[PDB]
C-alpha cells in the first residue's frame, strides 16, 4: 500500500495562469495549473495528502488588489479551500499586511495552518503545530516550522506580540514525543538550506535565517520527509534515507513524494520528485474564476498618468552599475516625500521602469512589495558602511564589472543592491569589500565620517533586511506610513511637467 504527500510553497497569491507582466499573458503556472497537476496524479495513489509550505497570502497583483478591494483575503481563501488541502505552514509573508488579517485569514481557511515555534504571548500563534494520522496500522506526525528571522524584515507593529524560536531548537525538543506517538516524521519547514546538502560547504552566511541543513545533519535518521521553501528553489533528492523537497515557486512545480509498504508493513520512502507544471487539454478555469481575472486585469490597466518621456529599463544591470532616469527618479520621489539628506531604493526583480504611459500593472511590478519607509539619523560612517555593503553586489569577472557569485547563488538577490540619492561616490569592485567606496559626497562637502546625516530606506532595511544591519535601532527621524506603490502613485499625479532633478550620481569600475 501506499501514500503520496504532494506539496506546492511560496505559491505567492499566483492563482491564475500569469505573471502579469501583460494583460494576456498565459504561462504554465499558478496554482489553478499546479492543482489540476496534483488532482489527475493523485488517483493513482491508496491516498493522499495535499500541502501548502508556506507564503501564500503575499506576492502577486492579485494581492495587492485584494488589500486594495475589500481588504479582505476571502476571495483568495476561497481558491484554496475549494482545492481541499490538508495543511499548511506559515511563511514570513503571511505576516505583510498585519496580524489581524492573517488571523482572520486563518479562520477563513477549512484546514489547519501548523506552526509550532512562533509564539503569541504564552503560547503558538496558530491552534496547533503538530498533526497526527493513520496510514494503515502506523502514525505519521507532522510538525510545521517557520524560518526564526522574520524580525529582521517585518514592520514592527506587524509582529510586537510575537516571539520567534529557532525552528532547529523546537524541532529537536519535539522530536523525542513525535517518536513516541509516530512511525513516520514529516516536518513541514518554511524555510531552506544554509549549507550545500551534498558537501555541507556554507552557501549563505550562516544568521539563523535558515537551518534547514543542521536540522538534516542532526535529525535526518528520524525525520522521513522534509519539506522546505522560502528560497524559491528547486530541490528533490535524499539526505541519508530522508526524502527532501523545495518546490521552487508560484506554481511552476510540485513536489511529490511517496511512501509505500515493505513486507513488515512499514513504510518506507519510495520516490521523491518535482513533477513539472504544465497545460493540458483538460484543463478550464470557470466563469467566475475568470471574471475575477478579468476584474484585476481591467484594475491593472487602470491609468496613473502620461509622462513626457519615456524611463524603459532595457537591461536591468545597466541600471544597477550606472545611474538610469527611473533610479534617479524613484530616489527624487524618495527624498521629496521625506526631506532626508539621502534616500535609496532596490531595483525589484520585476522592475523595467515606466513608459510613458504609466497603469497600476507598471507601478506594482517596480515597487511589488508592501513596504513603508523610515528617515534614520547615521553617522557619515554608517552611511558608507551601507553603501559599502550594496557595493558587495559587484564582482569583477575577466575585466568587466559583473554580479558576485554571493548575490546569485543559490538564488539571485538583486533587490539587496541599493541605488542612493542625494549622495554621489565612487565604487571600485577591484577593491576589498568594506573599501570600495570612494568620493562620497552630500551637497558640494565631502561626507563627514562624525557628523549626523538623515537617510530614507524602506521599512525592511530599516530592521536590517538584506543584511544592513547597521540601520538597525538608528534614531528614526520620521516615519513615513505610505507604501511604496502608493508613494510612486502621488508623486505621478502632483508633478505634471516631471521635471526631475539629478539626485543619482554615482560609477563604478575596477
Ligand atoms: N523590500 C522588501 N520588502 C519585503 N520583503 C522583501 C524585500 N526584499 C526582499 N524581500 C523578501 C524576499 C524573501 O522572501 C525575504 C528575504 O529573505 O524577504
Ligand atoms: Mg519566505
Ligand atoms: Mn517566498
Known sequence: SNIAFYVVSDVHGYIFPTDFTSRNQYQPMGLLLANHVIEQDRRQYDQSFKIDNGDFLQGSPFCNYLIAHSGSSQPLVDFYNRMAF??????????????????????????????????????????????????????????????????????????????????????????????????????????????????????????????????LEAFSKDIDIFITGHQHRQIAERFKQTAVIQPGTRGTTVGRVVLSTDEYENLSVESCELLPVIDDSTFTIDEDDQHLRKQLEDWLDYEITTLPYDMTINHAFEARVAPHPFTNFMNYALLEKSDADVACTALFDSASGFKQVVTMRDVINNYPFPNTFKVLAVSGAKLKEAIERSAEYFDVKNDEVSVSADFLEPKPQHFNYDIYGGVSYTIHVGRPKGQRVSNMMIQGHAVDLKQTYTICVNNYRAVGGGQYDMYIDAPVVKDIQVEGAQLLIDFLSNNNLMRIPQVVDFKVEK
Open 86 to 215: 490538508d495543511f499548511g505552514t506559515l511563511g514570513n509573508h503571511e505576516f505583510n499586511y498585519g496580524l489581524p488579517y492573517l488571523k482572520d485569514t486563518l479562520r477563513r481557511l477549512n484546514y489547519p495552518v501548523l506552526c509550532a515555534n512562533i509564539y503569541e504571548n504564552d503560547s503558538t500563534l496558530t491552534d496547533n503545530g503538530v498533526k497526527y494520522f493513520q496510514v494503515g496500522d502506523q502514525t505519521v506526525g507532522v510538525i510545521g516550522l517557520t524560518t526564526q528571522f522574520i524580525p529582521h524584515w517585518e514592520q514592527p507593529e506587524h509582529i510586537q506580540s510575537l516571539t520567534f524560536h529557532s525552528a532547529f531548537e523546537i524541532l529537536q525538543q519535539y522530536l523525542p514525543e513525535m517518536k513516541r506517538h509516530a512511525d513516520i516524521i514529516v516536518v513541514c519547514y518554511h524555510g531552506g538550506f544554509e549549507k550545500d546538502l551534498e558537501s555541507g560547504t556554507p552557501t549563505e552566511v550562516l544568521t539563523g535565517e535558515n537551518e534547514g541543513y543542521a536540522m
